[PDB]
Ligand binder design. Structure first.
Ligand SMILES: [Zn+2]
Ligand SMILES: [Zn+2]
Ligand SMILES: [Zn+2]
Ligand SMILES: [Zn+2]
Ligand SMILES: [Zn+2]
Lengths: 261, 216, 355, 211, 446
């Protein structure tokens, strides 16, 4: 009755992968797609009760991706390859939006997990975990939405694992620390698949017995909105919770004067 | 004050002729509050005219406690009304509209390293990947190699870069338990003294200056 | 005279968000629980005490989840006396342990609302004006004993600007209703366990800030998780200040959280520093209440037959087979019943709006 | 007296304070004042009066004062008074009215006077209990006010103590829920615009009946 | 016995030959523990041997026993092997054939076992999944009726020969139907998946008798395990031994085939769960419970097939036979008769729990505890007398000599019972000669 769900979100930013292709590095988007498909096939391979959900995170939108080889695995690979090709060939850059829609893909994944849990019969319990690979740079405007997704995931008690490839993100570190997930940056991209198998593939019960590298240290500094500089102790607004380094009579955000006599 | 101090409180009969009075002072005070006559009798009789236990026995045997026919019914009604009156008498004796919501979009997160790329050539690179993965075929051998696997194992091996640090030292056995207790006591004392020190701060009155000097 | 005839032959026959207003950013909530003989009643299975305390644990968990910067105090009124069951703090483990211990208590005597309210006011007397003073009372019995006039205490509480909310179990009490109305709180009556849970969930959300609510610029610190390594010469193990308060020997931790103002060491957050009074919080804790700032408005309900559009949900890609379809006001997406309920209750954000 | 001797009244006093009126109106007023103060002090106060006493004559109950009114039997007048017998005989000989019918009418009028003062409006709700099997009689039941008899559900006819307590609990819980005057608009309360509606006027005309 | 127990006892050559089938590798991996699965996934692309210490350092110290269990299971199945790593180390490396077939199955490549039976187009006489399931039920019902001996069930003689070799029914008198033994009764009282699993295990134990390739049969069974219910496959491409085994399965109802010459075959759910044995299929939607048990030890059956009637009559006294109802009574005499027949109490309790009526399922206990306890007591009554033949030694003159002889007997493991207080002991008759010789030799050395 142990249903293990591994939802995989792929950063499908065309800008970062195009730049990487210009670099002519050993690792390309094709290798990443192959590694993701192999990891999903292994996840479904370990147990029948295991379920796989793959959603592509693209700037335009979030795409629900899903002969001697297994029929179900072959069908899943063909569906995934068809969907990613359909998205990428029709992915036309129309606008200055460069940051990938990370928050929307996470929200759609959470909705899918909730729908599956409702569809899951009471005879079985559906353990859910999410693994997200980070390739491009992080998004600043999605910070509030990212935090809201983190809180909902913690409320539903769903592990969130982050796999940084090139650019680190403290938001992912905080998400892994809060939700209990694993955060790690892969130094050698061609070896990435093994990092998926050796670390992220085992479930939390399996990860318990296995000895794993210690989690990365995460800080929780704050930026003072008047200059967005890191601060230790700041003045917090009682109305709109805005933080200021120096005492002010009137808050800039909520426009409420501080009635301190 | 509860009205059950008489009905619920009964002379407790033990197994063999035991009058377990359990005359707690709480019940006596409730009786005095409800019935000042009992207090007056106690003051005028105990302990000279009669003992406390004798007075309680008389009260139990008196008609005051055993109130139990028109005259009898009227007497019972009057007693209940008087008790209720005495108990009652003794019972007394803003719409918010923020200006800059974008602060929530980029909150306590400091200014990041968000860098914009080059000019239109990036779109051409966007074309390149668009042309690179337009005709894509799955690969198996190219995914992993023996050398890459060995490097990953070495990184994941104990003592490697990924396996940060390792075993530590038992600090518990290095510090004697008596020294630990003394350190705890010193920590508590210093914390209380510093709490008293910071309580004065900020110093807005001259007395706080002297108090902080004494604390130092 | 019914003995004349009797036959059954014929029986053998074939057949709710408010407006964009200020709320309780800082909350100091105290819980009052009745401990009278009426708590032994079986109105809620199995009895009032066990179900009430389980729902209290759930309420505490949800309240700490939604209000990281709040405080919870537990007061039990038994035998016409008030006992501070749990100290006013923000630790959920201590509150849960205290409630579990109180599960096996004895319910006897009569409630004493006056004593509990006086104790709460004395505790909340020293609290700053900007912090909101909130009182929750569980009133099982319909009668209470007050050693003094309660109306004077009601006036004192009104002058102290303390909010009192009462959730009765049997029926409505006029005195409690008047007290709740004067203190600005809400009075409720329990219909069943589900109604009790709904009332608790409603009371989890901060009450709207009144006109008399203060607006002061409070200063807070956000220390990092300072962890010391024994390999480094700068490893100084020290017992946590909070752990010193317990009878058990505190654990000598190598690192943790150190107060930026006075170097006070604490192993739990968000906990206000006891030495200098600084409130040591974290960035996720502050953002945990941002959903209250921007509530998610209810989506338009249009039945599937009357909606001629996409047949797949925008949130879960599920085929729209429900009799009702929820469409967002901003991006006009398509959401099924499950996704609409989850977004309104938990997500509080629309994926299309984020896009 | 029997309650006190049996000891059951002791538990009643433990639950709520007990106040019993007497023949003297001077102390009766003090008892009523104490009852009202206790009801306003949050402590239960119970009043035990007679259908012919001063309480049933000129005492009015606020919503929190008329929560529960219980009539112990049909208050038939003491027939040994020859004045009552002579009046009944005169009424029968001059109006063809049976003495039993007149006695039942008078008793039901007294009961309605005792119970009808517990409601002060839409926001006022109270409990009415009639502890007697005789009220189940059709002739006796039919002599109740229409605004009260209409709400007399047959499912509550001749219940027991436990059933009455359960129904009282259900009614109290249902009617203690928060309510808004806006809900009364169009159903039990009419605004200025609702008066102009001809359908509302027709409903008002259908509400009243002439006999 | 589970599947892995039979696999673990196979010769290395059989395991190596089975490793050439990617479906076999998939089944083996699925049957491994989660820790073993993680270890295999780690070593999927590892072309170099892994030092044993490095492998052991992965798991927690507390979970070492579980780690050692997984290591021993992997070693016994020959999934991996130890290699003399240079420098004196003992590296661990997966089987190259097994690893290659696993990669072929997962990563792709290789060749399909079935040649896309859609070449023949749609089946003109195709059936439905409920029809296939009913036919599978009917065939096993026929087999069970034949085992009972009813004339309504007529099966092939070689099928009865398998039972005779299995020992369920012994042909004491040729020409007459064989008498089913106690083992046959125990087999009948087992649940249908358990019965099928035990029958297939017995068939495998005597697979070499028919000259059928064990490797081919096991691989074919593994392929049928992952097959899709209601989908046909190509008969072509199989050896004559495989064709005969497929015909046998068709006779068992596990495989549907309209004619012996048909090129299509539909695997059934029973064959799908056959590889898993008794576990795996936790959500078996069996027939609704038709047996109602009353406090007066009365059984009411809402069944009409004579198989269930005979099963109930095996340990109960029949009372009434209605067209849609069978009324019997549970009696001590019938229970003792069943016990003498070899029936154990647990089998009856489990069978009754399986056939529990939905009305009785409403009760917190599935069956009345008093009835179960009475059945257990009746079972315990039979074995009150414990018979143990042996030789008694009681003439010990010295305590030291008695202790020495007792120690020698315990060394030999032939001790039956000992009484140190009275210097009395009991030894096995087979071990009596050895103990007697030792005792005589001790006097000789004296
Ligand atoms: Zn502000
Ligand atoms: Zn600043
Ligand atoms: Zn401090
Ligand atoms: Zn949906
Ligand atoms: Zn929207």
């Amino acid at each position: 009755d142990e249903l293990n769900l591994l939802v995989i979100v792929v950063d499908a930013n065309p800008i970062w992968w195009g730049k990487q292709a210009l670099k002519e590095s050993q690792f390309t988007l094709s290798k990443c797609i192959d590694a993701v498909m192999v990891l999903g096939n292994s996840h479904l391979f370990m147990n029948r009760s295991n379920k796989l959900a793959v959603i592509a995170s693209h700037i335009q939108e979030s795409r629900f991706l899903y002969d001697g080889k297994y029929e179900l695995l072959t069908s899943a690979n063909e569906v995934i390859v068809e969907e990613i090709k359909d998205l990428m060939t029709k992915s036309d850059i129309k606008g200055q939006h460069t940051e990938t829609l990370l928050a929307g893909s996470l929200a759609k994944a959470l909705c899918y997990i909730h729908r599956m849990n409702k569809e899951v019969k009471d005879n079985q319990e559906m353990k859910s975990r999410i693994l997200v690979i980070k390739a491009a740079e992080d998004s600043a405007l999605q910070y509030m939405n990212f935090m809201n997704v983190i809180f909902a995931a913690q409320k539903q008690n769903i592990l969130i694992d982050a796999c940084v490839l090139d650019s680190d993100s403290g938001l992912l570190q905080q998400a892994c620390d809060i939700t209990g997930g694993l955060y790690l940056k892969v130094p050698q991209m061609p070896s990435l698949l093994q990092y998926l198998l050796w670390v992220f593939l085992p479930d939390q019960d399996q990860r318990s017995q296995l000895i794993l590298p210690p989690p990365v240290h995460v800080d929780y500094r704050a930026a003072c909105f008047c200059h967005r500089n890191l601060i230790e102790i700041g003045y917090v607004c009682s109305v709109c919770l805005s933080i200021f380094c120096n005492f002010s009579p009137i808050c800039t955000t909520c426009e409420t004067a501080f009635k301190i006599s | 004050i509860s009205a059950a101090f008489l009905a619920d409180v009964r002379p407790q009969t033990d197994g063999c002729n035991g009058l377990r009075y359990n005359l707690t002072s709480d019940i006596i005070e409730s009786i005095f509050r409800t019935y000042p006559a009992v207090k007056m009798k106690y003051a005028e009789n105990v302990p000279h005219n009669m003992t406390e236990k004798e007075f309680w026995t008389r009260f139990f045997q008196s008609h005051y406690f055993h109130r139990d026919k028109e005259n009898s019914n009227a007497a019972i009604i009057k007693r209940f009304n008087h008790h209720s009156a005495m108990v009652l008498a003794a019972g007394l004796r803003i719409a918010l509209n923020l200006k800059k919501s974008d602060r929530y979009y980029h909150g306590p997160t400091p200014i990041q390293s968000l860098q914009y790329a080059t000019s239109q050539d990036i779109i051409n690179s966007f074309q390149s990947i668009r042309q690179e993965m337009e005709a894509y075929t799955p690969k198996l051998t190219q995914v992993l190699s023996s050398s890459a696997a060995s490097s990953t194992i070495t990184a994941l091996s104990p003592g490697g870069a990924l396996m940060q640090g390792g075993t530590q030292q038992a600090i518990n056995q290095m510090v004697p338990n008596d020294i630990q207790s003394e350190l705890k006591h010193l920590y508590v004392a210093v914390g209380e003294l510093l709490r008293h020190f910071w309580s004065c701060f900020p110093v807005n009155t001259p007395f706080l200056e002297e108090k902080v000097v004494k604390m130092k | 005279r019914w003995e004349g005839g009797y036959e059954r032959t014929w029986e053998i026959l074939k057949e709710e968000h408010h407006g964009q207003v200020r709320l309780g950013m800082m909350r100091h909530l105290y819980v009052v629980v009745d401990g009278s003989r009426t708590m032994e009643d079986q109105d809620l299975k199995p009895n009032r005490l066990t179900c009430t305390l389980k729902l209290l644990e759930y309420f505490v968990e949800e309240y700490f989840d939604q209000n990281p910067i709040s405080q919870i105090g537990i007061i039990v009124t038994k035998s016409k006396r008030a006992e501070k069951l749990t100290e006013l703090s923000g630790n959920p483990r201590k509150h849960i342990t205290s409630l579990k211990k109180a599960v096996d208590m004895t319910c006897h005597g009569e409630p004493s609302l006056y004593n509990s309210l006086s104790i709460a006011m004395q505790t909340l007397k020293h609290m700053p004006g900007h912090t909101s003073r909130e009182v929750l009372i569980i009133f099982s019995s319909l009668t209470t004993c007050d050693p003094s006039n309660i109306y004077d205490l009601i006036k004192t509480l009104k002058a102290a600007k303390i909010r009192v909310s009462v959730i009765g179990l049997s029926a409505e009490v006029r005195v409690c209703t008047v007290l709740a109305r004067e203190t600005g709180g809400t009075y409720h009556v329990i219909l069943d366990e589900s109604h009790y849970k709904e009332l608790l969930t409603h009371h989890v959300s901060p009450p709207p800030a009144s006109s008399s609510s203060e607006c002061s610029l409070i200063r807070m610190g956000f220390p990092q998780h300072t962890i010391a390594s024994l390999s480094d010469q700068d490893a100084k193990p020290s017992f946590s200040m909070a752990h010193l308060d317990g009878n058990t020997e505190p654990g000598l931790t190598l690192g943790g959280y150190f107060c930026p103002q006075c170097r006070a060491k604490y192993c739990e957050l968000p906990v206000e520093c006891k030495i200098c009074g600084l409130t040591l919080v974290s960035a996720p804790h502050l953002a945990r209440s941002y959903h209250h700032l921007f509530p998610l408005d209810a989506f338009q309900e249009i039945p599937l037959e009357e909606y001629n559009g996409e047949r797949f949900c925008y949130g879960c890609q599920g085929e729209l087979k429900d009799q009702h379809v929820y469409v967002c006001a901003v991006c006009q997406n398509v959401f099924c019943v499950d996704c609409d309920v989850f977004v309104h209750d938990s997500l509080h954000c629309c994926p299309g709006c984020i896009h | 007296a029997s309650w006190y001797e049996q000891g059951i009244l002791e538990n009643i006093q433990r639950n709520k304070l007990l106040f019993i009126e007497t023949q003297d109106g001077a102390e009766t007023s003090v008892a009523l004042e104490k009852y009202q103060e206790a009801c306003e002090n949050g402590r239960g106060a119970i009043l035990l009066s007679v259908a012919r006493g001063k309480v049933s004559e000129g005492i009015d109950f606020v919503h929190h004062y008329g929560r529960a009114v219980i009539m112990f039997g049909v208050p038939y007048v003491y027939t040994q008074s020859r004045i009552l017998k002579a009046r009944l005989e005169y009424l029968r000989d001059q109006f063809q009215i049976r003495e039993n019918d007149f006695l039942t009418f008078d008793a039901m009028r007294h009961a309605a006077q005792c119970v009808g003062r517990a409601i002060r409006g839409k926001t006022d709700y109270g409990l009415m209990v009639f502890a007697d099997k005789r009220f189940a009689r059709g002739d006796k039941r039919g002599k109740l006010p229409r605004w009260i008899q209409e709400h007399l559900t047959d499912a509550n006819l001749n219940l027991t103590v436990d059933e009455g307590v359960q129904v009282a609990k259900y009614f109290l819980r249902q009617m203690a829920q928060p309510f808004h005057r806006e809900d009364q608009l169009g159903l039990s309360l009419l605004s200025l615009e609702q008066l102009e509606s001809e359908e509302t006027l027709k409903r008002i005309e259908q509400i009243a009946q002439q006999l | 016995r589970n599947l892995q127990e039979f696999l673990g006892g196979l010769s290395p050559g059989v395991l190596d030959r089975l490793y050439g089938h990617p479906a076999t590798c998939l089944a083996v991996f699925r049957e491994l523990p989660s820790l073993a699965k993680n270890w295999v996934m780690r070593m999927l692309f590892l072309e170099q041997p892994l030092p044993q210490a490095a492998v052991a350092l992965w798991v927690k110290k507390e979970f070492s026993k579980a780690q050692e269990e997984s290591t021993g299971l992997l070693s016994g199945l020959r999934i991996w092997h130890t290699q003399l790593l240079p420098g004196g180390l003992q590296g661990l490396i997966l089987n190259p054939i097994f690893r290659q077939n696993l990669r072929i199955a997962l990563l792709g490549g290789g060749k399909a076992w079935s040649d896309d039976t859609s070449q023949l187009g749609p089946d003109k006489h195709a059936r439905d999944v409920p029809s296939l399931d009913k036919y599978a039920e009917e065939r096993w019902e026929v087999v069970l009726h034949f085992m009972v001996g009813s004339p309504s069930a007529a099966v092939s003689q070689d099928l009865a020969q398998l039972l005779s070799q299995a020992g369920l029914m012994k042909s004491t008198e040729p020409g007459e139907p064989p008498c089913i033994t106690s083992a046959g009764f125990q087999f009948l009282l087992l649940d249908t998946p358990a019965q099928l699993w035990y029958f297939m295990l017995q068939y495998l134990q005597t697979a070499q008798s028919r000259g059928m390739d064990l490797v081919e049969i096991l691989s074919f069974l593994f392929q049928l395990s992952f097959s899709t219910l209601g989908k046909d496959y190509s008969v072509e491409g199989m050896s004559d031994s495989l064709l005969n085994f497929l015909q046998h399965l068709r006779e068992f109802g596990l495989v549907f085939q309209r004619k012996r010459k048909s090129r299509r075959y539909y695997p059934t759910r029973l064959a799908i769960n056959l590889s898993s044995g008794v576990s795996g299929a936790g959500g078996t939607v069996h027939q609704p419970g038709f047996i109602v048990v009353e406090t007066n030890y009365r059984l009411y059956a809402y069944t009409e097939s004579e198989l269930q009637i005979a099963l109930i009559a095996l340990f109960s006294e029949m009372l009434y036979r209605f067209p849609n109802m069978v009324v019997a009574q549970v009696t001590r005499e019938s229970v003792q008769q069943a016990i003498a027949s070899g029936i154990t109490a647990q089998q009856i309790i489990h069978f009754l729990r399986t056939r529990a009526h939905p009305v009785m399922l409403k009760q917190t206990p599935v069956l009345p505890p008093t009835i179960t306890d009475q059945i257990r007591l009746w079972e315990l009554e039979r074995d009150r007398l414990r018979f143990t033949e042996g030789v008694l030694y009681n003439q010990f003159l010295s305590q030291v000599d008695f202790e020495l002889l007792l120690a020698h007997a315990r060394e030999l493991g032939v001790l039956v019972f000992e009484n140190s207080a009275k210097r009395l002991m009991v030894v096995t008759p087979a071990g009596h000669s050895d103990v007697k010789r030792f005792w005589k030799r001790q006097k000789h050395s004296s």
